[PDB]
Design a protein around this nucleic acid. Structure first.
Ligand code: K
Ligand code: K
Ligand code: K
Ligand code: K
Ligand code: K
Ligand code: K
Ligand code: K
Ligand code: K
Ligand code: K
Ligand code: K
Ligand code: K
Ligand code: K
Ligand code: K
Ligand code: K
Ligand code: K
Ligand code: K
Ligand code: K
Ligand code: K
Ligand code: K
Ligand code: K
Ligand code: K
Ligand code: K
Ligand code: K
Ligand code: K
Ligand code: K
Ligand code: K
Ligand code: K
Ligand code: K
Ligand code: K
Ligand code: K
Ligand code: K
Ligand code: K
Ligand code: K
Ligand code: K
Ligand code: K
Ligand code: K
Ligand code: K
Ligand code: K
Ligand code: K
Ligand code: K
Ligand code: K
Ligand code: K
Ligand code: MG
Ligand code: MG
Ligand code: MG
Ligand code: MG
Ligand code: MG
Ligand code: MG
Ligand code: MG
Ligand code: MG
Ligand code: MG
Ligand code: MG
Ligand code: MG
Ligand code: MG
Ligand code: MG
Ligand code: MG
Ligand code: MG
Ligand code: MG
Ligand code: MG
Ligand code: MG
Ligand code: MG
Ligand code: MG
Ligand code: MG
Ligand code: MG
Ligand code: MG
Ligand code: MG
Lengths: 66, 50, 70, 91, 49, 99, 249
RNA sequence: GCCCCGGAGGACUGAGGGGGAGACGGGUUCCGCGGCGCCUGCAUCUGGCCGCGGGUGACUCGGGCCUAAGCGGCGGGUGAAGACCGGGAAGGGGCGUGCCCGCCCGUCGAACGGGGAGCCGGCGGAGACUCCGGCAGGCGCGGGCGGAGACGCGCCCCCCGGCGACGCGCACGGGGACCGCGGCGGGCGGCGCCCCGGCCCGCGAACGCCCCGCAGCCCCCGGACGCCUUGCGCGGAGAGGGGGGCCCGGGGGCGGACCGCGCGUCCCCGGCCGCCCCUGAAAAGCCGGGGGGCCCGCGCGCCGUACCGACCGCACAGGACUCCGGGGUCAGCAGCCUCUAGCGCGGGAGCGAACGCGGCUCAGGGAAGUCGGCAAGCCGGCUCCGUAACCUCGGGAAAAGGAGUGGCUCUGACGGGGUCAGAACUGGAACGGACGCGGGGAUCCCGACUGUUUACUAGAAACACAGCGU
RNA sequence: GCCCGCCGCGGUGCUGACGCGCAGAUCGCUCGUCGGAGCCGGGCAUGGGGGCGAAAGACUCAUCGAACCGCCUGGUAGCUGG
C-alpha cells in the first residue's frame, strides 16, 4: 500500500489502471485498487467533490460511512 | 515421528487397515467357532519394526 | 457439504499416482466444468484426497447435484 | 603505587609451577607483548599476531619474524653476511 | 568522569578557558583530583585568577 | 500477564539463522518475527575495506544501477588503489624507456 | 599378549594426521623454461599461519607463463619477508632474502633454506622454524655442491638443485616452557593423536614387554638390537652408548 | 452423586514449572457418539480399554539442491576364488552446417550448517505460517548524464575479484521486548472503623514511500604544543576547526488501519581492547571489473504435516536433546511465599501398644563412649577493628580473634534516582528474629599443583602432567 | 587449567534407607567440581587373539585374563547321579 498525490490519481484512472474506488468519510479517504498496490488519498469533502465528478465512468465507485 | 518417508508411511498404513475382527456374517458363512483373529495387535504392547 | 455450499469446493478420492495437473484436466473433461485450484494429501490409510475448488462463476451445488453428491 | 615487587606480569600464575619457569616466562612474555618499530612506517606500532607474524597497526604491512620478538640475532647476522657477499659479487 | 568531562568541554568551547588550561585539568580529572563538580569549579576559578 | 511464546521454526535448535524478535499484533498478541542475517557489502581487492556506495543487500535484489560505482574499476578498487595503479603504470613507462 | 601401542599406529584410523583447515603443501616454484634461461618475478600477497606448523607460510602470485592470468604459490617464509615484496626465481636472480637460485650460483658462507636434495624436486631440507643450511664449497669439475644440514652432518648435492636465500622465520619457538598439561593438549590437538603418554612399566605384561612385576621395573636391559622384530623393538634401539656425560666435542 | 461432571470452599506444582511447544522414538494412542465383557493391582457411571463413524489441504515452513568429516565409482592391478586395492587412460562441450574450445568422477553423505521469497484477522468436534478474507513478496512465461571530489542518477566468451563465510572474553554503548510508578477513561470487589490507598481492561503486523540515524571509513580547504575514551587511541604517510560523501538487522511521519516518566532484566547489534607453540569449514548459487565480440495477462509440479515424553527399561520413584520464562524478599536463574496456566500419585476408615523409619527437646558433667569424635552439634549474611610462624615474595588470610545490626522520627552528601554516612526516641536486656549460610588451631607421613580411574564392594599414596635425560 | 556458590557433570561418608526392591545398582542427607586437559546432541571412523585404553586387565549393547550367533557336536571323561 502507498499514498499518492492527487494529480497522479487521475492518470492511473485515465489509463484504466484502477479496478474499484472507495470513498470513506471520517477528511475523506479515497482508495483505488490497482493490479500492484492499493493507493490512498486524503482530502477534505470540499475537494473530493470535483475529483469524483472527474471520476472515470469505466471505474466503479462505492461509498462508505458509519 | 512427524517427519517420515512415504515408504514407511505406506507399510504402517497397511498394518492399521488389516487390524480388524472377523465379520459376523463370515462366521455364519464359513461355520466358524474360533472367532478371534489372532493376527491383531495393540499399540501399547506391540513392536512393529516398520 | 459445508465445503460446497460455501467455498465452492468438492472433495474427491483419486488414484495415488496422479498429480495436481492430471487431476485438474480429468475433472474438467468428465464433469464439463472449470476448476480453479487443487489441494491434495495422502491419508493415514494410503489414499489420495483432492480438494477441488471450482471457478468463481460456477456453482458446485449445480455440479455436485447432477453427479448425485447433492 | 607499585603493586608487586618481583613477579611482574607473572603474578597471574599465583604460587604455581616453581621459580625457574616463572623466571623464564617473565622475560619471554615481556618480549612478545612489546611494541616494535615499523621498518617502513618508522613508527613504533608493530605487534605480534601469531607466532612468527608481525603487523604494523599504522603501515598495515605484515612481516615475518621471530616467535617472540620481531628480529632474532641469527637473522641479523645472516642478513649482514648475505649483503656483504652480494656487494662482493659486484666487480 | 562523564560529568567532569562534559563540564570541562563546555567551557573550552565557550572560550571561558583556553586549550592549554583545558588539557591540564582534563588530566587532573583523570587522576582523581576532584571529588565532585563543586570542587572542580573552584579549581577553575583559582586557575583563572 | 503471561507473555511466553512457542518456537516458530521446524526445530528449536537455536543456530545463527534461527533468531527471532518480539512484536505486539493488532489483535493484542505477542508474535515472533525472524531476524535475517545481514550480508557484508563488497570489499576492496587491494586493501580489504568496504566499497563505498553499495548497500548491504544481496545483489540479486538490487537494480543494476544500484550495484555499481561510476569510475574505472568502480566496485573493485577503493579509489585510492586506482590512483596508485595509475601512477605506477605511467611512471614505469617513463623509466623503462628514456632512461 | 596383544598388539602393543606402536603396532596399532601403522593401521591408520585414529592415528592419522589432523589435516582439516590446512592451507596446502608448501613447495618451491616448479622449474620451467623461463627460470632455466632467466628469471621470473612474483609478489608477496599474504603471510599466513598454518595449522599444526610452527613457521608461517607465504602466498606469492606469479604470472602465467603458458597462458593468461596468474599463478599462486605457497612458500615457507624466510625471516624478513613482507607483504608487497618482489621476489625472483631463476638462474639470473640476485642475492636477496626471498629469492630462489641454483645452489651452484650461491657463494660460500650464505644461509639458505628449503633445499632440494635432487634437482627439480621442489625442496625438502631445512624447512622447520629457525633452521637453515650453509653452503660450504663448490666442486666445479664434478658439478657437486657441499652443504651443512641443521644436524651438523655434511652432504653433497647437485649444483642445479635450488634454494631460497635466508633462514626460516619463527625462530626461538622452543625456548618458551609449556607450563601446563593444557598447553600440551592444545599443541597436539592440531597435529595427531599422540598425547598423553602412558609408560610401559605402568602396564600389565599382556600390553607391553615392560609390564608386570611386584615393583615397577624393566627387568632386563633396555638396549634392544637392530634386527629385533615388530612388537619386540621397544626401549633404546641399537644404541652405541648410554648414560649422561660430558666431554663431547 | 462414583476417585466422573457442576457449583462453593481449602490446598498444591511454583516461569531450570505436575505450564505452553518442537526433535527423536511410538503408530492411530487424535476426534465425536455409545458402552462396561477384558484391562484401569480398591471402586467406576472414568479412561491411552471395547464397538461404530470420522480426521493431517503449502510458490513463501521443512524435505528434493550444495557441500563437511566420510563413503562409493574409475582403462586397470592383484589374489585359488569370494573379493579387495587404484589417476596416468585416445575420458565432452558450445552451437548452426561446419568450425571452434577442452586433462581426469559422483542429481552419495546435514528434516540443527549454506539456501530467492509471508504478514495480520477470522472460521471448525478433531487441521492451519497450509483453509477463507484482506495486504504483500519471489521466480518464470506470453502480449549516457550530473558533481571540484568522495560519490549521485542488454548480452556473450577469457581472465581478475566479491558475497555466501564464520573463535573466545571482562567491560562500555544503542535498539527492541518485558517490567514498574503516576495521570486520565470504562468496569469490579469488600466495607466493625479507614479508604481519590485494593483489583481487571485501555490493542496496531509484514510490506511501500519520505525523513532522521552515534561509532566507523572516505572527500575539499589548509598547514599544527592539540583532539579524545570507563579503558584506550590518533596526527606532516596531514591533527583541530569550517563544509560534505557512504555504510548502519534501527527510529519516526504518512499509508496498511489514551497520555507521560523511570531502575533493572533478557535478546540481538556496534566500536574498541585483551588472548593463543590453539588463529577458529566447504560448496551450490548470485554479482561486479578489465579486455574483446555484439504497462497488461498467465503459471508455480513431487513428498512430510493428527497426537504424545502414549519413548527404552518384560508394565516401573530409573534413563531420555532443545525452545519461551511474570511478582515480593534478596548479591541472585539460591532458599521461602505467589499472578497466569495446570491440576494424580495400585483405594478408604478406626486406634493412638511394643518395636522400627524420618524428626524435636533434655538437669549436672563434657569424649570418661568407641578400633577411631562414626553420628550429631558448634561456626556462618553484611560493615568496621584486628591479624603470627613460614614462604618459590605470588601467598599464608575469612589466619587467629573482637564490636555493631530491629522499629520509628529526622539530617547531610552525589546529577530525577538509589545508594552511602550520621543522630534523637523506643521495645522481657531484642533485631543476618523464618529462610539461606566456614567450626578453629599446633604438627608428622605421602603425592608438587588443576586433571584421570576399577559402569555394579577399591577415588588413592595408583595413572597423567609441565620439567629433565638417554 | 585462581577461590566461595546455582543448574549441569560426578559419586566421598553415614559402612543411613532398601535389600521376597520403586529399581537385575535405586532413594535421603552429606560431599567433589563449576571458564577449563569443561559438559551435552547429531553425523562419521576403528571388529574379536582383533579394536580401543591419562593403564583399573578396564571397556567393546545386563556378556570380557578373549563378545555374541549357528554349525563341527549326542565333542571326550579311569570321575558324580540314575
Ligand atoms: K505426524
Ligand atoms: K509400541
Ligand atoms: K600380539
Ligand atoms: K596377540
Ligand atoms: K605383538
Ligand atoms: K591391541
Ligand atoms: K589421546
Ligand atoms: K607418562
Ligand atoms: K616388568
Ligand atoms: K462413555
Ligand atoms: K591368481
Ligand atoms: K587383492
Ligand atoms: K553431506
Ligand atoms: K547437521
Ligand atoms: K538442510
Ligand atoms: K558458512
Ligand atoms: K577487473
Ligand atoms: K499440521
Ligand atoms: K492400635
Ligand atoms: K517388642
Ligand atoms: K575419645
Ligand atoms: K561428621
Ligand atoms: K534501625
Ligand atoms: K597420585
Ligand atoms: K579446579
Ligand atoms: K571395589
Ligand atoms: K573406585
Ligand atoms: K579424590
Ligand atoms: K589408575
Ligand atoms: K552442584
Ligand atoms: K537407621
Ligand atoms: K542411586
Ligand atoms: K569457581
Ligand atoms: K585399525
Ligand atoms: K570396530
Ligand atoms: K578376542
Ligand atoms: K568368540
Ligand atoms: K549353537
Ligand atoms: K560348521
Ligand atoms: K576326563
Ligand atoms: K572327569
Ligand atoms: K545327574
Ligand atoms: Mg500436502
Ligand atoms: Mg596396574
Ligand atoms: Mg610379552
Ligand atoms: Mg506452594
Ligand atoms: Mg480420547
Ligand atoms: Mg480394580
Ligand atoms: Mg525457503
Ligand atoms: Mg545429495
Ligand atoms: Mg538449514
Ligand atoms: Mg492442533
Ligand atoms: Mg559455519
Ligand atoms: Mg501440530
Ligand atoms: Mg545436656
Ligand atoms: Mg578413651
Ligand atoms: Mg573404654
Ligand atoms: Mg595428587
Ligand atoms: Mg583434585
Ligand atoms: Mg566399583
Ligand atoms: Mg566408591
Ligand atoms: Mg577453578
Ligand atoms: Mg572451587
Ligand atoms: Mg549401607
Ligand atoms: Mg564344544
Ligand atoms: Mg556333551
Amino acid at each position: 500500500p502507498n499514498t499518492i498525490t492527487e494529480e497522479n490519481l487521475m492518470k492511473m484512472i485515465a489509463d484504466g489502471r484502477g479496478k474499484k474506488l472507495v470513498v470513506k468519510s471520517c477528511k475523506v479517504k479515497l482508495k483505488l485498487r490497482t493490479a500492484k498496490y492499493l493507493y490512498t488519498l486524503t482530502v477534505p469533502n470540499a475537494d473530493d467533490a470535483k475529483s469524483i465528478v472527474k471520476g472515470c465512468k469505466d471505474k466503479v465507485e462505492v461509498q462508505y460511512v458509519n | 515421528t512427524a517427519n517420515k518417508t512415504l515408504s514407511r508411511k505406506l507399510r504402517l498404513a497397511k498394518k492399521t487397515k488389516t487390524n480388524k475382527n472377523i465379520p459376523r456374517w463370515v462366521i455364519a458363512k464359513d461355520h466358524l467357532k474360533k472367532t478371534w483373529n489372532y493376527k491383531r495387535h495393540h499399540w501399547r504392547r506391540s513392536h512393529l519394526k516398520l | 457439504t459445508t465445503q460446497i455450499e460455501k467455498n465452492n469446493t468438492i472433495v474427491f478420492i483419486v488414484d495415488r499416482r496422479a498429480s495436481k495437473p492430471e487431476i485438474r484436466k480429468a475433472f474438467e473433461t468428465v464433469f464439463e466444468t472449470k476448476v480453479a485450484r487443487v489441494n491434495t494429501l495422502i491419508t493415514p490409510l494410503g489414499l489420495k484426497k483432492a480438494f477441488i475448488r471450482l471457478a468463481p462463476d460456477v456453482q458446485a451445488m449445480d455440479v455436485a447435484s447432477k453427479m448425485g453428491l447433492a | 603505587a607499585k603493586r608487586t615487587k618481583k613477579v611482574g606480569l607473572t603474578g597471574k600464575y599465583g604460587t604455581r609451577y616453581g621459580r625457574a619457569a616463572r623466571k623464564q616466562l617473565l622475560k619471554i612474555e615481556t618480549s612478545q607483548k612489546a611494541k616494535y618499530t615499523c621498518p617502513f612506517c618508522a613508527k613504533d606500532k608493530v605487534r605480534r599476531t601469531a607466532c612468527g607474524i608481525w603487523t604494523c597497526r599504522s603501515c598495515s604491512k605484515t612481516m615475518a619474524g621471530g616467535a617472540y620478538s620481531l628480529h632474532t640475532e641469527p637473522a641479523n647476522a645472516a642478513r649482514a653476511t648475505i649483503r656483504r657477499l652480494r656487494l662482493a659479487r659486484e666487480d | 568522569q562523564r560529568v567532569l568531562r562534559r563540564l570541562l568541554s563546555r567551557y573550552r568551547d565557550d572560550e571561558k578557558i583556553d586549550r592549554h588550561l583545558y588539557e591540564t585539568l582534563y588530566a587532573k580529572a583523570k587522576g582523581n583530583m576532584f571529588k565532585n563538580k563543586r570542587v572542580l569549579l573552584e579549581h577553575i576559578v583559582g586557575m583563572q585568577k | 500477564a503471561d507473555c511466553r511464546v512457542t518456537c516458530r521454526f521446524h526445530s528449536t535448535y537455536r543456530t545463527r539463522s534461527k533468531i527471532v524478535r518480539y512484536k505486539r499484533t493488532p489483535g493484542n498478541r505477542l508474535t515472533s518475527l525472524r531476524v535475517k542475517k545481514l550480508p557484508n557489502a563488497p570489499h576492496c581487492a587491494e586493501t580489504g575495506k568496504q566499497i563505498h556506495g553499495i548497500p548491504r543487500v544481496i545483489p540479486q535484489h538490487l537494480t543494476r544501477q544500484q550495484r555499481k560505482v561510476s569510475r574505472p574499476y568502480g566496485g573493485k578498487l577503493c579509489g585510492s588503489a586506482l590512483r596508485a595503479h595509475i601512477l605506477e603504470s605511467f611512471l614505469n613507462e617513463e623509466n623503462q624507456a628514456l632512461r | 599378549g596383544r598388539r602393543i601401542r606402536v603396532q596399532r599406529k601403522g593401521a591408520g584410523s585414529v592415528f592419522r594426521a589432523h589435516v582439516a583447515r590446512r592451507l596446502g603443501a608448501a613447495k618451491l616454484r616448479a622449474n620451467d623454461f623461463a627460470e632455466r634461461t632467466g628469471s621470473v618475478r612474483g609478489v608477496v600477497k599474504a603471510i599466513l599461519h598454518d595449522r599444526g606448523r610452527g613457521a608461517p607460510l607465504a602466498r606469492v602470485q606469479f604470472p602465467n607463463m603458458r597462458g593468461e592470468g596468474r599463478v599462486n604459490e605457497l612458500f615457507i617464509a624466510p625471516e624478513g619477508m613482507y607483504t608487497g615484496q618482489e621476489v625472483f626465481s631463476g638462474n639470473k636472480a640476485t642475492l636477496h632474502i626471498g629469492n630462489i637460485l641454483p645452489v651452484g650460483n650461491i657463494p660460500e658462507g650464505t644461509y639458505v633454506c628449503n633445499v632440494e636434495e635432487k634437482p627439480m624436486d621442489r625442496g625438502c631440507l631445512a624447512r622447520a622454524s629457525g633452521t637453515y643450511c650453509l653452503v660450504v664449497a663448490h666442486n666445479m669439475e664434478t658439478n657437486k655442491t657441499r652443504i651443512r644440514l641443521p644436524s651438523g652432518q655434511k652432504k653433497l648435492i647437485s649444483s642445479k638443485a635450488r634454494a631460497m636465500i635466508g633462514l626460516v622465520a619463527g625462530g626461538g619457538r622452543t625456548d618458551k616452557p609449556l607450563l601446563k598439561a593444557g598447553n600440551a593438549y592444545h599443541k597436539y590437538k592440531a597435529k595427531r593423536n599422540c598425547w598423553p603418554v602412558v609408560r610401559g612399566v605402568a602396564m600389565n605384561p599382556v600390553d607391553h614387554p615392560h609390564g608386570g612385576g611386584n615393583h615397577q621395573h624393566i627387568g632386563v636391559s633396555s638396549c634392544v638390537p637392530r634386527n629385533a622384530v615388530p612388537g619386540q623393538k621397544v626401549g633404546l634401539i641399537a644404541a652405541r652408548r648410554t648414560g649422561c656425560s660430558g666431554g663431547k666435542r
